Structure 1
Amino acid sequence: TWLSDFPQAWAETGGMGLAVRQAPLIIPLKATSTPVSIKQYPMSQEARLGIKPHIQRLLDQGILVPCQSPWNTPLLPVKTNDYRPVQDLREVNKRVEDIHPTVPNPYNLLSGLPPSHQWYTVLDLKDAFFCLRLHPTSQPLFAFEWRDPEMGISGQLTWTRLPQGFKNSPTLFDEALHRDLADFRIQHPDLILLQYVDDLLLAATSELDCQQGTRALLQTLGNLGYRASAKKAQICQKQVKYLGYLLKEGQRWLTEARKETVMGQPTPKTPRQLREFLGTAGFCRLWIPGFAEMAAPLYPLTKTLFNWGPDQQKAYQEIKQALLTAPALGLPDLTKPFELFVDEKQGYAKGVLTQKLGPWRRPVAYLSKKLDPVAAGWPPCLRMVAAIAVLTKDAGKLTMGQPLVIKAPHAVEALVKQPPARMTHYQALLLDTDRVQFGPVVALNPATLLPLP
């Protein structure tokens, strides 16, 4: 019934997308750039015949158009017996002006979601980038060659919409939609709307508010020319998957699918493989307690010889073990006080940001960082101070200057005041007791990192 009441909004019924409020895009190039014409890949026939209807359908939609350009890039077939066209815009991307990535990575986005809104509707937009038009100035940029030896049709085609493979399509679209939805954001103070490029989350306090909000959102998305996938929608559910995170009743999990992308990486044998392993797993560092110290043996194996010893394997094992046993994280409650439990061992700072839940403490985040070399050399009880200081600044990213209590296995509010160099900067954000308070000393659990009775 959600399908009929909004025909224009679903890609299944509402046809092709087109941001009506968006002007055609001009694509600035680098100053030293010059047209590059790459010879066409001598395509197979088995591919050229499966690719053909996709191309024809784009011509009918006017998204592809004939042209004649000094530019040209390869059109490769890809992957059942379903061949889809994919254009190698590498040499083009190199010649285009870079832009500031204003896209907030999934986590920092989800972090902006309150627990008081436990009714979710997730949507994704079908053929997002194509909804944006390409100004005739910069169309010739994405020209490619199309032939059909069964016809003798060696001509050129190019895109009238923002293409796939172009390095700036994500940011551009994100900005476009963010602009196009500001109005909807304004006219719904009771709803939270989250956005990663073409992935949308609508959070509401009640189920009613959610339903109505979703109706509004769909009507708007329709009116704007955007089109959502009805097959993959998650409408008005207490529990939803969004950007590879499971949201359910004021709580947040790593979906198993998101785990797999790290769990499924073979033991890195080259330094680059290890780099990207840590790079991928690094996104889930706020689920891994003591991650900075845990992944310590693996860091030095970068850019040197690659001695994959027992330590490296042990760490590599810990990191996956820590994902298999990754906890639930509660969405930060900015209408509550925060508690921060900090600890340090061997020049690595680890800690946990928690909040009240019933009489229990529910972890909001696990904070861990390496102490800079100068601090890493400091004596035992000073590195603690350094650790607390470092983690506090990271917690600030989540608490938003809210009231925050600190606890450590060796309380140390004193030494902050009477240091017998770098203190001028530490006393700044620590002795500011409007946001920051201390607590009694207390040792914490090596795993959970919560206090001991």
Structure 2
Amino acid sequence: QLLQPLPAEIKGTKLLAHWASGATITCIPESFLEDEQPIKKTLIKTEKQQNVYYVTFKVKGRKVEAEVIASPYEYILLSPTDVPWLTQQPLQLTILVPLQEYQEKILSKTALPEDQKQQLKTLFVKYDNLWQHWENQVGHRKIRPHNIATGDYPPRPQKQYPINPKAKPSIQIVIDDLLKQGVLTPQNSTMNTPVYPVPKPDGRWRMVLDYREVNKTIPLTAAQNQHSAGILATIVRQKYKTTLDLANGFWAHPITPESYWLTAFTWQGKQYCWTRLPQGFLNSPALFTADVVDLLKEIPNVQVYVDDIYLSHDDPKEHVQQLEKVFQILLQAGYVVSLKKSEIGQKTVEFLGFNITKEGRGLTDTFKTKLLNITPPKDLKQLQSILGLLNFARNFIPNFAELVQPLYNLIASAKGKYIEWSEENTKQLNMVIEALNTASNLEERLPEQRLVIKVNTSPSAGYVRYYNETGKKPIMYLNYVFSKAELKFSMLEKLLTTMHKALIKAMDLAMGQEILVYSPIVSMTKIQKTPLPERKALPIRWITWMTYLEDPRIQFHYDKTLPELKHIPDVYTSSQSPVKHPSQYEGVFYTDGSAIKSPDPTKSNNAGMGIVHATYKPEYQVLNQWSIPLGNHTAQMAEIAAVEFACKKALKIPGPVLVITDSFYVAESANKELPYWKSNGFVNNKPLKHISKWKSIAECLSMKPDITIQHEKGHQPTNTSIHTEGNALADKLATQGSYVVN
């Protein structure tokens, strides 16, 4: 548990002892007390009677004589009396995690009222032993050790190839910590497993075991929890939502001493074995999750997939009451929670087993059906991709040949491998999409025909088409938004996470009908054999992906007519179409800019912008004011540079903010022109200072998209809205700076 294990040898074989606090005598693993003769026989309430012995053993090299009983466990429960010299000391591993930055981060983003928010800040301390304090820290689970030695024909040992030495230092720490905790034991074995290193965003590296050779031997003989699909159907979305990431829980379940040889691996010419369940093993996710489910059975609403846990209660007070009940269970069992990726008491959770963020109160996940806009292609190869993409809608769209005709005429126009794109063509393309958004082309779902799903993906997002098996029109298209982590995935994994998000909505439309999925992938079996270093997603992703093949209701077919969508341009995402109230934003930024006639005839101009930071959470208040002269520039430039300053100051505040411009051109450009100027490369603006200002705004929004931009004329507004009052102050500051000369 929280006490550091102590190295000890009893009968030649090394073992570990744990300082106990109970007054009961020392327990010893059962396999050593068979040969020994019993002194007497006593019964224990917490009544079964067991034999009593008196054996000698070494603790840290010093022999110890004590009256002992048996223990079904693999550790030596050490009575404090028998060892008066040795004192209890807490566990001390290598690296201490930044636990205070984690808790302050969770307290910041919590959507709970300040009343319950202080209860949580108190719950950090009462259950301090529950959170993960050390890196690679694991907990002990007082459970009957698992037997994973199923199957009479053992697998063949794999030779260990040299690995990257740049990863050895960061991994040897983990080897030391697990050895220190007894998670790893030095022991030769018949089986050997390859080990692979993969980098971590912080610069260090984590090791990966290749257990697919042992999994082909071990048969599937365990009760599987509801899979990704079955869990997501029974969920209950209430007011607040909370997710708790465990610290590799399979490292908490110990395996039987007989099964240690199976999990063996070679590190630095030395062979080690696993005391606990290892990650990448066949039955580790199932054996671990089942235990977790029983504990969470008592809670009214819960869902557990792998490490992640889900809790959603509508009552603010009851969410915290159940949350404390969750913590006691996890602390009493010996589980360890990582506050690095945990999310507590938020209106939406970023990840709940599935990659989709969960908002609202809906038992079934909802997502936008309609396809999204596409940025103009920069090259011919990116324009040929989108044409062969729309080729499917020829057989059921009347105006198709008429609305696509202009784009065909544009390709042969230049004939110089460079293509010129007109702004109206961008609007024409937007019309092509709106035709698909119209429910005419949308066929109706038929409960008789099976559900056909055609899946392809672009570097920016995926494209999913739900069909009827005979129908020429699709029931409904589906376009999934890639998260910042999924964009890092390889192209093959972008398809798989796309299919994952597509089979979710298919369950709603299945209605007891088998589902056939067509995909550019030729063989599903070959995909499981895809090499490991090419997978750039978490194993939780692949397990979640592979668990869907086993369903006989779903079948996957290779489709040749699916085109290549690697050169598909970026999907146009609009953060301005949703409008949010100014009170819910954490920060409000009013901007403005003026430019009177310069006194000097040479400059001929003078500018001055104004910035106001306002917060509406408690009442209408202003944090700071700013009034800056900009020299000879455009009045709109003063209104252009006014938001570049405001965009930066929002980065220091992690939360929803809103910037407001008196200018029409600024807000409209940030909504439609900015997604263009990014891909446009700022071509044919405007000399160089003008372009640098727009890029800086684009990059600032790239680092934090939580920034929304509105626009309000505010011409002689007596008291139109409570919002225009703050903008009247910003225009005052912009005017003051415009009147000041250097």
Please give the range of the TM-score, normalised by the shorter of the 2 chains. Answer: 0.5 to 0.7
Counterpart selection for 2:204 from 79, 82, 96: 82
Cα distance change of structure 1 residues 265 and 10 upon mapping to structure 2, 3 Å threshold: closer
Counting only pairs closer than 5 Å after superposition, residues 113-124 of structure 1 correspond to structure 2 as: 113-114=235-236, 117-124=238-245
1:93 match? 215
1:178 match? 293
Structure 1 distance, partners of 2:147, 2:178, is: 21
Counterpart selection for 2:133 from 1, 12, 15: 12
Structure 1 distance, partners of 2:341, 2:290, is: 23
Compute the displacement of 1:169 (Å).
1.1
Structure 1 distance, partners of 2:341, 2:222, is: 30
Q: Does 1 or 2 have the higher relative contact order (CA < 8 Å, sep 6+)? A: 1
Would the aligned equivalents of 1:21 and 1:180 in 2 still touch at CA under 8 Å? no
Counterpart selection for 1:103 from 225, 229, 237: 225
Structure 2 distance, partners of 1:137, 1:146, is: 21
Counterpart selection for 1:155 from 270, 274, 287: 270
2:329 match? 220
Counterpart selection for 1:250 from 344, 361, 367: 361
Structure 2 distance, partners of 1:16, 1:88, is: 23
After superposition, the C-alpha distances for 1:279-335 in whole angstroms (9 at most, x for unaligned) are 4454244399799xxx999469856x98854xx349999xx99x99xxxxxxxxxxx
Structure 1 distance, partners of 2:172, 2:517, is: 52
Cα distance change of structure 1 residues 248 and 161 upon mapping to structure 2, 3 Å threshold: same
Structure 2 distance, partners of 1:277, 1:224, is: 33
Compute the displacement of 1:209 (Å).
0.3
3-state DSSP of counterpart to 1:60: helix
2:284 match? 169
3-state DSSP of counterpart to 1:91: helix
Would the aligned equivalents of 2:141 and 2:334 in 1 still touch at CA under 8 Å? yes
3-state DSSP of counterpart to 1:122: strand
Q: Which amino acid aligns with 1:48?
A: K
Counterpart selection for 2:503 from 276, 283, 294: 283
After superposition, the C-alpha distances for 1:107-134 in whole angstroms (9 at most, x for unaligned) are 432322346x333222121121101111
Compute the displacement of 1:210 (Å).
0.4
Would the aligned equivalents of 2:520 and 2:559 in 1 still touch at CA under 8 Å? no
3-state DSSP of counterpart to 2:341: coil
Cα distance change of structure 1 residues 42 and 217 upon mapping to structure 2, 3 Å threshold: same
Structure 2 distance, partners of 1:133, 1:306, is: 42
Compute the displacement of 1:174 (Å).
0.8
Q: Which amino acid aligns with 1:171?
A: A
Corresponding position: 1:65 with 2:185: yes
Counting only pairs closer than 5 Å after superposition, residues 121-132 of structure 1 correspond to structure 2 as: 121-132=242-253
Counterpart selection for 2:482 from 245, 260, 264: 260
Structure 2 distance, partners of 1:55, 1:263, is: 31
Q: Which amino acid aligns with 1:260?
A: F
Cα distance change of structure 1 residues 164 and 245 upon mapping to structure 2, 3 Å threshold: same
Compute the displacement of 1:86 (Å).
1.8
Structure 1 distance, partners of 2:135, 2:565, is: 51
Identity %: 26
After superposition, the C-alpha distances for 1:87-124 in whole angstroms (9 at most, x for unaligned) are 22222222212235623233432322346x33322212
Structure 1 distance, partners of 2:491, 2:206, is: 32
3-state DSSP of counterpart to 1:138: helix
Counting only pairs closer than 5 Å after superposition, residues 196-345 of structure 1 correspond to structure 2 as: 196-241=305-350, 242-243=352-353, 244-251=355-362, 252-253=365-366, 259-260=481-482, 279-280=499-500, 282-286=502-506, 298=518, 308-309=560-561, 312-313=562-563
Cα distance change of structure 1 residues 246 and 139 upon mapping to structure 2, 3 Å threshold: same
Corresponding position: 1:34 with 2:154: yes
Would the aligned equivalents of 1:22 and 1:176 in 2 still touch at CA under 8 Å? no
Compute the displacement of 1:75 (Å).
2.2
After superposition, the C-alpha distances for 1:182-204 in whole angstroms (9 at most, x for unaligned) are 3xx1xx5xx31121122111122
Would the aligned equivalents of 1:145 and 1:157 in 2 still touch at CA under 8 Å? yes
Cα distance change of structure 1 residues 306 and 88 upon mapping to structure 2, 3 Å threshold: closer
Q: Which amino acid aligns with 1:169?
A: S
Q: Which amino acid aligns with 1:179?
A: D
**How many residues get paired?**
299
Cα distance change of structure 1 residues 177 and 28 upon mapping to structure 2, 3 Å threshold: same
Q: Which amino acid aligns with 2:161?
A: Y
3-state DSSP of counterpart to 1:195: strand
Cα distance change of structure 1 residues 228 and 30 upon mapping to structure 2, 3 Å threshold: same
Corresponding position: 1:140 with 2:231: no
Counterpart selection for 1:46 from 166, 183, 199: 166
After superposition, the C-alpha distances for 1:71-95 in whole angstroms (9 at most, x for unaligned) are 2122222237523222222222222
Compute the displacement of 1:161 (Å).
0.8
Cα distance change of structure 1 residues 77 and 18 upon mapping to structure 2, 3 Å threshold: same
Structure 2 distance, partners of 1:39, 1:297, is: 38
3-state DSSP of counterpart to 1:233: strand
Q: Tell me which moved more, 67-76 or 220-229.
A: 67-76
Structure 2 distance, partners of 1:94, 1:297, is: 26
Would the aligned equivalents of 2:261 and 2:273 in 1 still touch at CA under 8 Å? yes
Cα distance change of structure 1 residues 250 and 34 upon mapping to structure 2, 3 Å threshold: closer
Compute the displacement of 1:67 (Å).
0.7
Compute the displacement of 1:206 (Å).
0.4
TM-score by length of 1: 0.56
Structure 2 distance, partners of 1:145, 1:301, is: 35
Structure 2 distance, partners of 1:155, 1:14, is: 23
TM-score by length of 2: 0.35
Would the aligned equivalents of 2:245 and 2:308 in 1 still touch at CA under 8 Å? yes
3-state DSSP of counterpart to 1:84: strand
Q: Tell me which moved more, 258-267 or 55-64.
A: 258-267
Gaps of 5+ in 2: 1-120, 369-460, 463-479, 524-556, 575-742
Cα distance change of structure 1 residues 97 and 82 upon mapping to structure 2, 3 Å threshold: same
Cα distance change of structure 1 residues 307 and 238 upon mapping to structure 2, 3 Å threshold: closer
Cα distance change of structure 1 residues 289 and 43 upon mapping to structure 2, 3 Å threshold: closer
Compute the displacement of 1:263 (Å).
8.2
Larger radius of gyration: 2
Compute the displacement of 1:50 (Å).
3.5
3-state DSSP of counterpart to 1:202: strand
3-state DSSP of counterpart to 1:232: strand
